[PDB]
Amino acid sequence: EFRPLTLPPKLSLSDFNEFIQDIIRIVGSENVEVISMKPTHTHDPTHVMDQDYFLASAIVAPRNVADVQSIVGLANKFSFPLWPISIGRNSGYGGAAPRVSGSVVLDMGKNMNRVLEVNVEGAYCVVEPGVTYHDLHNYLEANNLRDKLWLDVPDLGGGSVLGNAVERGVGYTPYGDHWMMHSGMEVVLANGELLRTGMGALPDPKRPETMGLKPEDQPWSKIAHLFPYGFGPYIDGLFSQSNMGIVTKIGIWLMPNPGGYQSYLITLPKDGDLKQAVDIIRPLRLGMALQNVPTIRHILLDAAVLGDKRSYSSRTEPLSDEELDKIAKQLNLGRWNFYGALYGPEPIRRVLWETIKDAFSAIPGVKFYFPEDTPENSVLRVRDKTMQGIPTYDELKWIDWLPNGAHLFFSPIAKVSGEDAMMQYAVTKKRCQEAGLDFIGTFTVGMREMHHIVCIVFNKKDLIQKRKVQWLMRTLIDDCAANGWGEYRTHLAFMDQIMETYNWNNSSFLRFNEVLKNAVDPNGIIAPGKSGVWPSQYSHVTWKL
Amino acid sequence: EFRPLTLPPKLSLSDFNEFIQDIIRIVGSENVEVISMKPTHTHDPTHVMDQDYFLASAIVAPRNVADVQSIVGLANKFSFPLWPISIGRNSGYGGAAPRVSGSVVLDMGKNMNRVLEVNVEGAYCVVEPGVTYHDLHNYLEANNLRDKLWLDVPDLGGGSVLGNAVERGVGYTPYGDHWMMHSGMEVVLANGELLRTGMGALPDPKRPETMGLKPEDQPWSKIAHLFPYGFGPYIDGLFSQSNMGIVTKIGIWLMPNPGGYQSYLITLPKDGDLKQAVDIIRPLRLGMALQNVPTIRHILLDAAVLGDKRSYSSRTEPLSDEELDKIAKQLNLGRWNFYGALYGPEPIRRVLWETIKDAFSAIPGVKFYFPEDTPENSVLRVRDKTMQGIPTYDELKWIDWLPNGAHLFFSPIAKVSGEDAMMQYAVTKKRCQEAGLDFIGTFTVGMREMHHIVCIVFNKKDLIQKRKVQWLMRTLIDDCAANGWGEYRTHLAFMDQIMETYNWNNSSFLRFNEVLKNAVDPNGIIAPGKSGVWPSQYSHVTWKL
Amino acid sequence: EFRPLTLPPKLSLSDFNEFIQDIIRIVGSENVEVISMKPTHTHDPTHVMDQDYFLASAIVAPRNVADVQSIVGLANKFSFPLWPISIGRNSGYGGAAPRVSGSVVLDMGKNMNRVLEVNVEGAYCVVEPGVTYHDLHNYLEANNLRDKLWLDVPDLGGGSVLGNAVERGVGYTPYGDHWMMHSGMEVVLANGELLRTGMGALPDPKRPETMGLKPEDQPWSKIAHLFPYGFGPYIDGLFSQSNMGIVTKIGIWLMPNPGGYQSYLITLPKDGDLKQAVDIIRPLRLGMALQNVPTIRHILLDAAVLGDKRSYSSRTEPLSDEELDKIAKQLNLGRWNFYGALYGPEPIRRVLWETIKDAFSAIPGVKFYFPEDTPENSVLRVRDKTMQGIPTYDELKWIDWLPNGAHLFFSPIAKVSGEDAMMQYAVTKKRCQEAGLDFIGTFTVGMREMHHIVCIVFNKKDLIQKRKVQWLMRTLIDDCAANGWGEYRTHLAFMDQIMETYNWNNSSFLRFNEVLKNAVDPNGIIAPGKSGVWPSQYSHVTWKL
């Protein structure tokens, strides 16, 4: 098609139509949309910034890897920026919106869907960008692999197994650190050239049945998904949260059924119980008593899962300390809520579980519950599935906290120290109040770190509050940096700020990144601006926010 | 000093004396050597290739990080290549020798020694290149941290904690994967600029007491050694086994005493027991019954530790199948020998230990022993310390298998499948006999892979045998590739061969690697040729072997 | 000379000795110093940062303008950075020290001394960098121009008339805005070429008596020192506080004796009288009742002039609110102290003076005094000379507040609003106490702004306090920016911080500045880093603080 709402930088409308005609001729009219459950891929859905911001010109859905190389060629030819997405369901990080309007959103999920391989002896799977978590789960069940191999899912299962992994997302099983569970990745660099990593570089020895296959369709050697390092420089991580390559295929390790599973819930009665709780979790996390990635939730998170905010109050301003206590009682929950699980044979679960309980019993009024012990609608019953690798749609209910809610995640990291966790909670809770927002969040326990997802929800049609939300977010970043904590991930608009945060020694780390980017992407057509990294033809003055 | 034996490429003697005077003027004459226990740093000690090869021109010991930047500057000024080393005790991988003669060996270890930090709450340590394993141990004990925090050592404790970690070395405790246990790394890139990665990029908030400190001496932010990723592209691995930067500091995670430890020995009687044993290890390793990295050793490895070859035979040719059997008996060992260990509270050790024995009992004549149950000189008593993070000097005894022995490691990776384990063993054993060399070796058990260190030992003054040793090596590489198995690490001379092995899709991995190298190192002064990666001013024709 | 302590970036010792020999051959050995009342020109005297920082390699005194061009040429030949100074008496702004060590301090003052012209009809003077304020005064008196023409001096008369003027210094007569009183400037750009601005570009018509004179020695056209603009782009300000050229000559307007002068002192009793006082000053300053730049001083400033801190207290920590009150009484001063002066015929002074008193009488306990009415040692008697263009050595007494005192100026600008004045005072006073430093300071009244010189004084041999002093400074900058107030000038180490403060629209002002710098100074030899502006061969990573 013809006249887009926004053309990518410096490109004429004639150039734009020449290009699109070319891509249409490659992937068919049914896979190239021009902008003149079902996630949008054309714009930031969790509106926070104004219009004209992060608006694609056209969404293109490659049929396969060839198509992605033809499309890269065309972007180099015409200097048309691309914005490669796998699924784009994470509104909160901006979903599928491109950072620089005019871009071509590359929907890799629509046709590049396959569960390429599920290896039981090696306990791994090889996946394309389209393979959501539900998909890999349905794949496992229709092949009876459910009782041999287990997944590891993020709070929502409609996300991409590889998209989430390359973005470094976390899960709640012993295999929760997703990016650390990859081995074998296939990438389409900016020059067009295909590249596979680690032992993906060591090629399967020739054999009659695999002769003549295009590179993209060739099998991988035996150790390709069993050892990640390969030999030499381990370049894999350049492709995480970066614009250095288009990730087309990835191997993810799978957890073999542990032959024993118990999920539990420990409720902490006071809002200041978080300090003792986190001091307790520390030694138990580092000492492997705490098997998976346990979560510490704030009462409104579980409150939200179960009901909107009018369902708990009429107040338009932020619920008070009293009201929060009251909601806790109502739900039989604590003010803070720990969710975890035990894996393996009963004799070992049992020792761990006595230890855990024992530890947490130094917190007055603590109360331990397994799923059965809680109401049918409870979060624990839902999270009992999440910690065993079973994906769900439940926990999405909280996005609706406010009427025309949208949300953004402010995500700092905090030591696994109560002192520190309380400090960061304070900081975020003050600002949230200052903005007139309920604080809503979780700490997910890392072995020596704690990912702190603050869920800022707000009215997507309210000019005043969105501006309040922007103030909040940018103030939180500074505040957090002032206290030496940075965010591990963000939405399109906060990328620059956040990368400006990592400025040790005069921005050394972003300087060095900008070289690697320009070297490998001389026309800078792969996602200019992702994570604050800009190719030289994108003046910082004109583009950073 | 004046006239070196080998000048670095294109450099005049005048230039060379200019430079040396400059460096002597920076770091003192007591630190800058000109080539006209105590490891050599001037040449490949495990001689294999001929002379002229891998011969430094001068060794230079920086006093600190400034000194490394000054030196980098002078390398960029004069176009003098540097070969940065930490310790260089790993003869076998060529130790300190530089890949291209004329290089300046940068001994970082001699002055950059400090155990910078040992954090108990976060359970990490931050170390300089000089900090050997024995060093971090002695540090621990003199601060009574020995019963709180535990190390993870490689078969020899004299190596560098960070050198080994950036080289992707492996250990025998649950934290055996060394490079996967780092978080926080400080680098001096080739441009001279300092860069710290991940959360090491988020700077510690100003405070009165740390003002005016050089970047090199600034503290790090709180999550710097607790979370590796930071934000954006996770560049860390570009500094593993590569020439992309000079590693100055690194944070390595430590293991919190587990409150329970049992090390053991299972002996496998026959030479073909390796196949069932490796099928047995598979599920227990993946299912976490097998806590640390367990090791399967071949009889001569343990034989070797205990005595030279003349001490078991007069034969100059390779010992026979019968003789090996006899040696096994003499030592009360198997033909193959599994070493592992149980960590934690007794109730849990016990269930795991019943599981392990149980499984291995399906191997005829299998015999299980704890340390106490074996002779005073036994390997198990030595490895009982190794699997608990206590480093030793013991296991070096085997390098002396032959009189003027030197050794080289042929290191393929193999699936954790007996089928595969035997296949690779076969291949390696043929060749070794074809060269008239005793096969000597180990498989170190990875969660889904097995590092297989073939120890080629030979007579460093024997022209004929060294050639035989070069034939062996190069033929094993090809053989191994033929059967789809790459090497994880190698010695200076096999670097090229080994990367050529990783040529999927027409050498994509190396091309893409040359791009990043040239970008960040236009003068190409950082270790040209490490891992097979060459900056553009070093003709491939002239330099690869 | 031979071996310097610090060589400028990338330069070999050989190169350095080549250059010095060349310069010694141009200006004589008596003028070119190699670093192996009387201000130092080799290093930052108000030590604050550590050593290695801001240390010149050699000081070079040009005999004249040719000599400055020869030297420029040699800097472009060898790529040696220069640090041009006039006098370098302003410790506090780092005096003569160069921003990047290894630089060549260009002392223009030592030989380029002349009062070139004192024109009475046009009421201007044309001066070289060496002409201090005392110098132009002594010139005036020896030519009896003292009752015809009047100077405008800064708190200390030993500074350079043009150095201070290009640095945008301020004075206390109606011609206090120094840089706004220049017209005619002669510059030696980095290419070596001489350029005079505005009407200094329109050349004096040839005439017999000025033929064959070097450009440097040519007279100027008639309107050269009467109208600043010329025609076209008014480039003059590119040479203020910048590294865009070496200023050799400048025309400064002089004030024609006004035939009437009364200087006075109004004392404000309370520490919060500053708010009403500044609201009072506002309208009178804008309405021209307030003739010169009036000053509001804090009690310790005047206290300081008169005596050290031990002379008022034993306390090592900062004097208290009560103590300050007591000192005020002892000296017959206020807590705050306004100094001004009336110019012209008595009938007009009188009406203004009734207006001033009248207004200030709305402040309880306000007391008005002329010089005569105050003690012999009083500050008013000292400043009575200052507001009439007579320079003095008096006011330097305060630098000795503490024993081995050094001082630094923290200089924010603030509106001429009491509200704002108090706000900024607050901010500054907290921090100063947090560092355990006596707040000492002045607001100098601008027509619509107020320059606020916080005098941080401290112990130059105290590591702990200097660090405290560095924390203070950097925290005040951020604080101040937080409240939208920039600094107008700073010391070498805060230059970067301070420009980063001016980052509207993603550092537009500095980017645009780097462009002009590089264009006119491709080798970047003119003062790299002054005001935060760096030529492209000086990595930001490596150089900013």
UniProtKB/Swiss-Prot annotation, chains A, B, C:
Give the induction text.
By 4-methoxybenzyl alcohols, anisyl and veratryl alcohols. Repressed by carbon catabolite.
Q: Where is this site: Important for the catalytic mechanism?
A: D155
Query: What cofactors does the UniProt entry give for this protein?
Result: FAD
Q: What is the reaction catalyzed?
A: 4-hydroxy-3-methoxy-benzenemethanol + O2 = vanillin + H2O2
**Which residues belong to any copy of the FAD-binding PCMH-type domain?**
52-257
Give the cofactor binding note: Binds 1 FAD covalently per subunit.
Q: How does activity depend on pH?
A: Optimum pH is about 10.
Q: Where are the transmembrane segments?
A: none
Which top EC class is given?
Answer: oxidoreductase
**What are the recorded Gene Ontology BP terms?**
lactate catabolic process; methanol metabolic process
Thermal response of activity: Optimum temperature is 38 degrees Celsius.
> Which InterPro entries does the record cross-reference, listed alphabetically?
Cytok_DH_C_sf, FAD-bd_oxidored_4_C, FAD-bd_PCMH, FAD-bd_PCMH-like_sf, FAD-bd_PCMH_sub1, FAD-bd_PCMH_sub2, FAD-linked_Oxase-like_C, Oxid_FAD_bind_N
Query: Where the protein is mainly located, per its record?
Result: other
In the record, which positions carry Tele-8alpha-FAD histidine?
H407
The record's EC number reads: 1.1.3.38
Listed A to Z, the keywords are: Cytoplasm, FAD, Flavoprotein, Methanol utilization, Oxidoreductase, Peroxisome
UniProt-listed Pfam families: FAD-oxidase_C, FAD_binding_4
Catalytic residues at Y93, Y488, R489
Protein name per Swiss-Prot or TrEMBL: Vanillyl-alcohol oxidase
UniProt note on regulation of activity? Competitively inhibited by cinnamyl and coniferyl alcohols and by isoeugenol.
* PROSITE patterns reported in the protein's UniProt record: FAD_PCMH
Q: What Gene Ontology terms describe what this protein does at the molecular function level?
A: D-lactate dehydrogenase (cytochrome) activity; D-lactate dehydrogenase activity; FAD binding; vanillyl-alcohol oxidase activity
